[model samples]
Target: TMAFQELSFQSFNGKDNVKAWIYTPIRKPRGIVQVVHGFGEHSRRYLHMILKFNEAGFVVAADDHVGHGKTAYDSGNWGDWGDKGYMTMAEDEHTLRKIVQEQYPDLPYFMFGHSMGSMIARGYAATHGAGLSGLILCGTSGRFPNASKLLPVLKNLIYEGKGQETDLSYLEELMGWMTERIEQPKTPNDWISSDPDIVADHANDPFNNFTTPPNIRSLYYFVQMMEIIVGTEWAEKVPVSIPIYNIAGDQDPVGQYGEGVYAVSNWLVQTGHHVKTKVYPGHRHEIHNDRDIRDEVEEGIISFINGIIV
Candidate 1:
């Protein structure tokens, strides 16, 4: 049976509730996997994957991040980001994991994170790697190419001093420019995935759009966390024995940016870590949401988890 719950937790000095969905297999579950959704998306978006994993005998739980889903700001500050935004989001994820573990302490726990969620997974792996049986990073990358260098400056100049939300437009443009070669300017949304419904839903969701003024400091903190994860220093902190699976679409702009997805694997290997990397030839950013090959993506995840657990 599928069960859903709301997780009220504290992070970044703010009290917020995370919308969570939990799925249990008909038979006893072999293990539990906590999922983390990407930026501008919520936990509900992964219901399909959650159900599939549950049917495959893995209990699944996912929570919407701060400022992202129904958990968005309590006030009119929709996209005001948050103090220490993304890093705090990662910590809140770990907090929720602790809550879940209290209820199922003996079950081996796994984590699956995608896109921006992948970044959170990296942070979780770095700090709480010992707590998890394994980790899967989908549609993730090692670094943000030149983003580390540019975003901080732009965020400060535009969002901080000027109090401008226009910087969000620039952020969108950066993503757009990376995928420009693959999609038509008029069909910008097509670059996200092959699913028309996913695209349409994203377009219509107010939460998905940039609503509040940008938080320059928070954006900087997010990038700093990314830099830490992609570097060898952070990789070395993770247990070398922990199994990690990294998957990204070759056509996905995020992976194609900078040194790309292969570079992500190389960093792991350099740190003497066990890692598996997969690149889907023609898929877009949201592999699980991609219409034509989402099943294949889900199957790949299932096979990986089964191999690890069994």
Candidate 2:
């Protein structure tokens, strides 16, 4: 029902270029949304979500983050995003945001981030909160019991021993414990969704990281980024008037099975930010990819976008 376009641009690295794409609408767009996808998955995998935005008359653009998908192919850096990578990758995202705004001036700009991408979204707001109409985070959280306290230190020590590019496969085994929260699971990613097919497809997807684990430094950076969002200090730094929307599932292990979401919502509410939250029962980390209630998730996001329309 709509046409799409592609573009390539140099990332903030000054050496590597990232790939970006957009789905266009038939009529004048209501706004523009820049999607920041989760770790290990490329932006292109979000075509289903992008099409929903187009149907609602919003232009959608997304790019593969550094060390991910085509960007990795171009950068030749498979698992590392470079030094101070948490902010470095966020800067590349801002670069992409600038290009998109330049192309579609005057439309309200929005940012949607999921999982690891949610960390980037939070970081982006802290540095550059002005001009964004809204910020939406999915599969996001407030704090972790041990991860926020020890994961970074652990990664740093491990990085020194194994080098930055060494695969952090143990992280995979560690994260696998998330599924233990479920009664019976098919795969570790069962914590991602209830759908076996979705889990299977993801397990089989070439672009969805399976064989190559995030290297030590990159894993460290990711943990650091999440830690930033976990603290109350970061929320206070964001503009008070910025409209924030959080959508997650009660069963999402990343969100501490709903405890983190509640903590975050309370903080955002007290911080005076315009905050709206939706927590679906029984859905997992990848709520949008859930088989039963994906339409509800999509429609809920569209509704939030509509509420901010000028």
Candidate 3:
């Protein structure tokens, strides 16, 4: 069995006391994987993956990002959101990595980022790509498409200027509408899955809500980061020799049914980066949460990591 420890580390972003969980292999780890979670979720949800990696002779560490999960500014502030300085968020992640490296200096390090975390991971890779053994991105996209035209003004005027907390619901609705169109279902829920428990849990989970809008400025910066990662310039910044893997569901609205993901991989390949891309047929945004496909997803992850390091 693997040994686990919970620890709190200081954030580089000035948000103090970032909580993290570290799982160590029963034997000496061959390497380490730092997992980054997406928006509206906490790091704890990735425990299943962490334990698997730990058992497989790899150390796994995950931290709650600022303004997300247990690290929220306040109990009721779950979706209240934050300012438009998301690069600071990426810096915070780098801080966590530095902390981990200090403790395990000799271990090969890899990164796995999902959805929003995938964007952050790309940011991390752009700046520190030379140091990593490999990188994995799940449920990530290359761009927000038409979102750029209006997001800035809307975010600044409504979220930043007026201090609005509900504008994010509008953004969520736009996303839901897109999901519904692709799935061609009566309700967006129909396309998501038939599982009622997952649906209920998502609805009830404060960290999984559609609202609680972030500060418009912060949201703008977050999109900017995404743009940077999705753009050709960002692709060139990544080392050509580094192994990269990208995965997403064919039905994932965030990626517009794999189109965005295709764009992401295409850019990486065109820029001379070694990369692998996979799109699971008929799956949704969260492959890790999908009961029917979770095993396959996990196996794919293990296979990729093993292929690179073993």
Candidate 4:
């Protein structure tokens, strides 16, 4: 039987009740793992990942961010994360951590993120790393440097016109250039993974907005948060003693075929962080879900956490 506890808490904003889950190991746990889900994806999707951590004697806590899953429906909040979309998401994770910490005050606490979650984790490392034992980023980016492509001003204008209820399919054309990286692609989202089945699963999920497009504000905040986390000034605020782990795909278009990944590692090192990085060859963006390297990637992460806690 599944050995996890279902729970909810008022969000950081105090308006919406956030749905959360805590997975406990049968034996005593060595540490706590807090998972921050990626854009348009919720925490529940990480059940498999949590199970692996549980077997390793870890207690894991995860929640769907506002505007994403069940939180989207009744959060006393509608859409748009206000001006602090960048801070709000990360702070929400902080709130989740505090809740879990109240339960397991003695265990070392670690944060794990993937994709946009990496961006949030980076934000957390910058704003609240003092509480965390370590940080792990998967399918993360280093720097876009090319801020012009994000078109923040134009995106806001689009947001003004569409509001939050309508999907701004207009911005769908924004990322068309990514197709240049495609080699014998099965779908436009092939940049995300080589597995057709995973792509199909993403499309079929109602919570996944991959095929559905996003509201302009959601798109705007994603680019905004990305810009904030990768900035040198913001990175300087992170604790140098905090250990960081970065994992990505060599072929991930988001990382410019590993250029961004290397840049991220180099930045962490230059900034005096104790960092470890890995780039799996031939894999795409979601290296965690990729078939050839899933176990290898998961085990590597489990070991990385062990190295710090044990």
- Where model 4 places Cα greater than 4 Å from the true spot, the runs are 1-3, 13-15, 73-79, 82-84, 145-170
TM-score of each: 0.88, 0.92, 0.87, 0.89
Q: What tens-digit string does per-residue lDDT give for candidate 1 at 1-310?
A: 2344555665553755555556677768788899998867778778889889888888787877766776774444445555454568777877778877776788888999998888888888887788688889887766676667755675566454653233565455445465465545445656676566767777777656444534555455556656767768777877876788888777677777324678877878898988887888777788788777889889988888888888
- Give candidates' CA RMSD values in order: 2.9, 2.4, 3.0, 3.0
Overall lDDT per candidate, in order of appearance: 0.72, 0.80, 0.74, 0.78
lDDT value for model 3: 0.74
lDDT of 4 at 54: 91
Which ten contiguous residues of candidate 2 have the minimum total lDDT?
Answer: 165-174
- Model 3, span 51-105: residue lDDT tens: 8888778888888876677777433544433543557667777877887777788
Give the clashing pairs for model 1: none
By summed lDDT, the worst window of 10 consecutive residues in model 4 runs over: 76-85
Name the candidate, 1 or 2, with the larger lDDT value. Answer: 2
Tell me the tens digit of each residue's lDDT in model 2 across 1-310.
3357787888776666788887776768899888999877888778888889988898898999888888887667667676555687788888888877777888998899998888799888888878989999899967754566557565667657754656555575447578877777867678777888888888887667756777676677777787887656888977876798998999888888888887787777787888999999988899988868888898888899899995
State how far residue 5 of model 3 sits from its true place (Å): 2.4
